[PDB]
């Protein structure tokens, strides 16, 4: 719901997964 | 190839 | 998934496995979009050319999984289906146009560290992110190569491809309800969905609000990870009006 797309073990704890930066870098 | 799941879910 | 890597724990907590009751086997991927609704590809449930026409009672969904084959006690949750809804204009006869289906669970699933819904895109998030070169992420327990199977959930990041390149890569008629993704031969890097990945999510992390959105559903390809070929994905936003209608009417 209002909490969709925020992962308990990542976004919710401000931890990044090993490859999400690859996605961000492509969003030019 | 798959581990059997609890029977409760197949009832 | 071909040329991917092992997912991290809790990396894709919306991942769902469609599981056949008898014989017990993996049928498809899918995604959790709320506590009672699961999104998948229509061809996971209905594909007459292969004599496939599943009913609610043939299937289970398994949520919160990492291992492909293990029963993940105290972690995964297994849910029965109340009702299947297939897009009324799903084109199984020709090109898998509108390859989308919803499944309503008999009971709400409890969210946990390993179970959590993905967002569906609005028009603006779709417009902003569905651009050639922008990368999304595909996950699944499907085959590791075209012609074997993974111990745990696999992940691969792939760039969206220009529509003319998608069209020119295949003889199949493409439509606005599809997009394609994957690296070109010259780009060096590789990766693709494969058999068994059907129905799983193509997701993107919005750089505007830092939330994951499901932009696509693994739909079709010709072979797996072939040079000059691309994976095709159901365009979730283009079909969102139908998704919303079903949920509003039957939720
Ligand atoms: N290979 C067919 C191509 C096709 C496309 C449209 C209509 C008819 C046939 C395919 O991907 N199919 C035939 C019906 C389901 C789908 C499939 O296997 N999808 C999973 C898949 C398999 N292999 C590589 C990639 C993918 Cl997504
Ligand atoms: C698939 O199954 C349903 C219900 O059993 C049936 O009514 C339908 O005619 C079958 N074939 C389709 C939808 O192509
Ligand atoms: Na073509
Ligand atoms: Na390719």
**Residue A21 host element (H or E):** helix A20-26
User: What domain count does chain A have?
Assistant: 1
Q: How was this structure determined?
A: X-ray
Residues of A with CB under 8 A from a CB of C: 1, 3-11, 17-20, 22-24, 26-28
CA of C164 to the centre of ligand 3 (A): 9
3-state secondary structure of A22: helix
- Which of C30, C202, C49 minimizes the C-alpha distance to C102? C30
* Residues in Cβ contact with C251 at an 8 Å cutoff, skipping those fewer than 6 apart: C36, C37, C104
SS3 sequence of chain C: CECCEECCCCCCCCEEEEEECCCCEEEEEEEECCCCEEEECHHHCEEHHHCEECCHHHEEEEECCCECCCCCCCCCEEEEEEEEEECCCCECCCCCECCCEEEEECCCCCCCCCCCCCECCCHHHHHHHCCCCCEEEEEECCCCCCCCCCCECEEEEEEECCHHHHHHCCCCCCCCCEEEECCCHHHCCCCECCCCCCCCEEEEECCCCCCEEEEEEEEECCCCCCCCCCEEEEECHHHHHHHHHHHHHHC
- Domain range for C169: 1-12+118-237
- Which chain C residues have a beta carbon less than 8 Å from that of A9? 9-11, 13, 113
Q: What is the resolution of this structure in A?
A: 1.5
Category of A12 on φ-ψ map: left (φ > 0), alpha (ψ -120 to 50) or beta: alpha
Of C5, C118, C134, the CB nearest to A26: C134
Number of domains in chain C: 2
The minimal CB distance from A5 to the residues C8, C135, C211 is found for: C211
Return the structure tokens found at C152: 């745990």
Residue C236 preceded by cis peptide, ω within 30: no
- Signed CA dihedral, C233, C239, C242, C246: sign only: positive
**Cα→Cα distances C9→A5, C53, C65, C114, C192, Å:** 16, 33, 9, 8, 21
Q: What is the CATH number of the domain that holds A20?
A: 4.10.140.10
Which tokens go with C164? 């003319």
Contact call for C24 and B5, based on CB within 8 A: yes
Same domain, C20 and C91: yes
Interval between CA C165 and ligand 1 midpoint (Å):
18
Q: Which letter does DSSP use for residue A25 in this model?
A: H
Say how far apart CA C168 and CA C16 lie, in whole Å: 33
Question: Comparing C-alpha atoms, which of C59, C155, C153 is closest to residue C114?
Answer: C153
Shared domain check, C199 and C248: no
Residues C187 and C170 in one domain: yes
């Amino acid at each position: 719901e209002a909490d969709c797309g925020l992962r308990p073990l990542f976004e919710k704890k401000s931890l990044e997964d090993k490859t999400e930066r690859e996605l961000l870098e492509s969003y030019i | 190839d798959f581990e059997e799941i609890p029977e409760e879910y197949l009832q | 998934i071909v040329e991917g890597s092992d997912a991290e724990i809790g990396m894709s907590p919306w991942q769902v496995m469609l599981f056949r009751k008898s014989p017990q086997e993996l049928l498809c991927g899918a995604s959790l979009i709320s506590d009672r609704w699961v999104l998948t590809a229509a061809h996971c449930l209905l594909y007459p050319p292969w004599d496939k026409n599943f009913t609610e009672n043939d299937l289970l969904v398994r949520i919160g999984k990492h291992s492909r084959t293990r029963y993940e006690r105290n972690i995964e949750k297994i849910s029965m289906l109340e009702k299947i809804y297939i897009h009324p204009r799903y084109n199984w006869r020709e090109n898998l146009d509108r390859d989308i289906a919803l499944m309503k669970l008999k009971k709400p699933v409890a969210f946990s560290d390993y179970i959590h819904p993905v967002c569906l895109p609005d028009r603006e998030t779709a417009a902003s992110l569905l651009q050639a070169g922008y990368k999304g992420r595909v996950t699944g327990w499907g085959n590791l190569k075209e012609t074997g199977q993974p111990s745990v959930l696999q992940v691969v990041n792939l760039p969206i491809v220009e529509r003319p390149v998608c069209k020119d890569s295949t003889r199949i008629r493409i439509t606005d309800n599809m997009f394609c993704a994957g690296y070109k031969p010259d780009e060096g890097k590789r990766g693709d969905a494969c058999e068994g990945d059907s129905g799983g999510p193509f997701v993107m992390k919005s750089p505007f609000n830092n939330r994951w959105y499901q932009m696509g559903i693994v739909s079709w390809g010709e072979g797996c990870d072939r040079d000059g070929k691309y994976g095709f994905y159901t365009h979730v936003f283009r079909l969102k009006k139908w998704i919303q209608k079903v949920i509003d009417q039957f939720g």
